């Protein structure tokens, strides 16, 4: 594995969860048992390392 960068759009493959985008700051309160979140547009909106 390797680290991640912000404001530079890249591809992310978290254990089979694949996607492309910028990895920017999360600023919303989440439940402790979350693995990943979604937005209104049915898209993977949040990711946890």
């Amino acid at each position: 594995s390797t680290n991640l960068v912000k404001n530079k759009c890249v591809n992310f493959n978290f254990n089979g969860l694949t996607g492309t985008g910028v990895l920017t700051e999360s600023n919303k309160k989440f439940l402790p048992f979350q693995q990943f979140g979604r937005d209104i547009a049915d898209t993977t909106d949040a990711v946890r390392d």
Binding site: G21, A41, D42, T43
Partner: peptide, 22 residues
Amino acid sequence: LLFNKVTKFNGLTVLPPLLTDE
């Protein structure tokens, strides 16, 4: 109020209008 009463990256592209909203 017309603008306010009226209330995205999945391969589609909402091309901005040639004539700007302004």
